[PDB]
Design a protein around this ligand. Structure first.
Ligand SMILES: *Cc1c(COP(=O)(O)O)cnc(C)c1O
Ligand SMILES: *Cc1c(COP(=O)(O)O)cnc(C)c1O
Lengths: 414, 414
């Protein structure tokens, strides 16, 4: 039941109801034999070709369960246990028993989670600069976003401690005190900053979240792109309270265009999210789930982790290329921290108040496109000296050209 | 864009903002080279094979525009023009210029439309019995659902006229008065009833929508499954005012499991749906959209309509089969109408109050299920004499078996 999670949940979310030998005339499935696609053959780099014969193609073209197809869900649960060993797998449902939901990309799960929790006027916690997409999702919900200080190691727990001191810990379960519903964070390779939390910080933030009793929403699309070969423990692995909701993405690792992600957290909150899925998308593409599931079952955890290693090596090499181009052209004209994960470099330009002018007007003129930092803040009209540079795609030639131009422009703009 | 649809739009919906030079480092795309699927071949029955070579696979696995791929959108826009010729294609944006959105199933779009529109306390109109999935969607949004009488030709205009008589026409644009936001209907082959609106009723209803200035939400997943070979004009075809939002579905025709449908309507409302999508699913599967696009462009409008004709002929034979089975076993035991479209027969059992015990314990034993009517009403705890029978899949033999058992169980309680 919802009873320990009710203070977190909206009146509308709580109001949702399920909306999913034997000759049955009771179902509402169309006839699959009418669908025009018949068989599929899918090629896999140095891998086993995936084949959908006639009967698997009928499955793939047909409706399937809201939470995901059972083979994928089971594979992903075992993955989570192997990687995070969450203490909640062993608890009753009311106490936050770990559960998982395949979603249509990890943004879908996150959005349904924000929609589940937020009433207008609710207080929520995040560190700016934050992903512009999360900001635009929170804005129409009408909550006050309360900014927590961050630095090259993510959220500074001293700043969080100081923000929360405006309440008493005893206020949390008092329905008349507007204590924070949650803290939102991207712990690995934050977009735009590139910075990651340390485990020391995570342990410290987790104790605060216990002390003031709010949820941690751990949005982690670069979990599998950490450049340090030992991965940092997640909030999920330390979640003794069942207060963590985790969003994982295949968008950087397997495919972004396939729209397959997954949400993991306390069963009663996952159930709310699934009930919302049941009246919207109904489920993620059955076809794309079968493609991924067949790949992952043939790979095993081991083949999966080898591919992740391969992808990390590529991004590591790209990261070294962009840092060298920056060392070359931008030293003394700008500041940046080495990215700990992900695909972005966050550059603070010296001696210029707002950089938006410099990029939109002048850089474009020169055939170079960087992104200004403005859209990563709650007040995006405030001036910004930062720009986000992507290193996922550019060649070393193109990075060299891009930074000469940026160097030229920094200097000309004084 | 908004001011004259603002009256229909929630506060949250209107607050949403957009959330989507030879060298660009400004982009947020992962490298598609890292994704493990390299090429794909999908066969089409008596059609040309769909091939994703190396470069088209990279595109299929990558993010794409929130409203859909440009080639699917243009092909669908030309389809709507051919089938419906909406008055609205020539209007400026603000006055409701026709626009289209590809969605992850037609239900995603419907859900985003209800959410975009409804504030707690709002009045909405519809006819019961209605789709249980629609009812579960509306329930948590807190609106007053006002039932409109329907019969075997669908919504009865005189009932609509009488209900609306409780409001003044000139209160519609009074912000302080709570006139109906919209009429929701499924005008071909309503699930569960199988009945369809006639064009005369459509004209009448449209004129009422104009008089009381509400929107029509035309949810039309069986439009391509009409058993009269000449299709009824749609609300979209007569939409001089730009007050019609139309949801189309490929689910019954091409594939339910690919999660591709689309929404047509006034650009300012479609714009609101898109902005919601940009912070949730982001877009529908690029892979699935490209498979469908290749299919449709190769077929052209003619191959598409020939395919549709074959699906109608198939379902039309199932309809005949289930009707014969009904005549054989149920004459003088039940009442039903012949379905005008869709895949359901709706049966009233005579001389019984609630079928729920009759089916969900007594008939399950003999190995037969049909859906009790309760879930198709706003108050599902009320007793129902009705059963919904699907004819999409069962063979004529299994139909005989189910109606034999049904006939028997009714005898055992007459
Ligand atoms: C890349 C990324 C994602 C992934 O989006 P999906 O919906 O999983 O495709 C989510 N959040 C951030 C901040 C990202 O950078
Ligand atoms: C079958 C059906 C649909 C189809 O939904 P998709 O999201 O397009 O699969 C929608 N509404 C009703 C009433 C239906 O019966």
């Amino acid at each position: 039941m919802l009873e320990n999670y009710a203070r977190f949940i909206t009146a509308a979310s709580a109001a949702r109801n399920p909306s999913p030998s034997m000759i049955s005339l009771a179902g509402g499935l169309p006839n699959p034999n009418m669908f025009p696609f018949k068989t599929a053959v899918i090629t896999v780099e140095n891998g086993k070709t995936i084949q959908f014969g006639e009967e698997m193609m009928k499955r793939a073209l047909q409706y399937s369960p809201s939470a995901g197809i059972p083979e994928l869900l089971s594979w992903l649960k075992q993955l989570q246990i192997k990687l995070h060993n969450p203490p909640t797998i062993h608890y009753p449902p009311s106490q936050g028993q770990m559960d998982l939901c395949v979603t249509s990309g990890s943004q879908q799960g996150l959005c349904k989670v924000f929609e589940m929790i937020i009433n207008p006027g609710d207080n929520v916690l995040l560190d700016e600069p934050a992903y512009s997409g999360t900001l635009q999702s929170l804005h129409p919900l009408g909550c006050n976003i309360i900014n927590v200080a961050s630095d090259e190691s993510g959220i500074v727990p001293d700043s969080l401690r100081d923000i929360l001191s405006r309440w008493k810990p005893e206020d949390a379960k008092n329905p008349q005190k507007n204590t924070p519903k949650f803290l939102y964070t991207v712990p690995n390779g934050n977009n735009p900053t590139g910075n990651s939390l340390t485990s020391e910080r995570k342990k410290e933030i987790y104790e605060l979240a216990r002390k003031y009793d709010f949820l941690i929403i751990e949005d982690d699309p670069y979990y599998f792109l950490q450049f340090n070969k030992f991965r940092v423990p997640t909030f999920l692995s330390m979640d003794v309270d069942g207060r963590v909701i985790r969003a994982d993405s295949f968008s950087k690792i397997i495919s972004s265009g396939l729209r397959i992600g997954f949400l993991t957290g306390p069963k009663p909150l996952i159930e709310r999210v699934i009930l919302h899925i049941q009246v919207s998308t109904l489920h993620p593409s059955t076809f794309n789930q079968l493609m991924i599931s067949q790949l992952l079952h043939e790979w095993g955890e081991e083949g999966f982790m080898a591919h992740v290693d391969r992808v990390i090596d590529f991004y590591s090499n790209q990261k070294d290329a962009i840092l060298a181009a920056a060392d070359k052209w931008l030293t003394g004209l700008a500041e940046w921290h080495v990215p700990a994960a992900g695909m972005f470099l966050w550059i603070k330009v010296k001696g210029i108040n707002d950089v938006k002018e410099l990029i939109e007007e002048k850089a474009v003129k020169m055939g170079v496109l960087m992104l200004p930092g403005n859209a990563f803040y709650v007040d995006s009209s405030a001036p910004s000296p930062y720009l986000r540079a992507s290193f996922s795609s550019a060649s070393p030639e193109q990075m060299d050209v891009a930074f000469q131009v940026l160097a030229q422009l920094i200097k000309e703009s004084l």
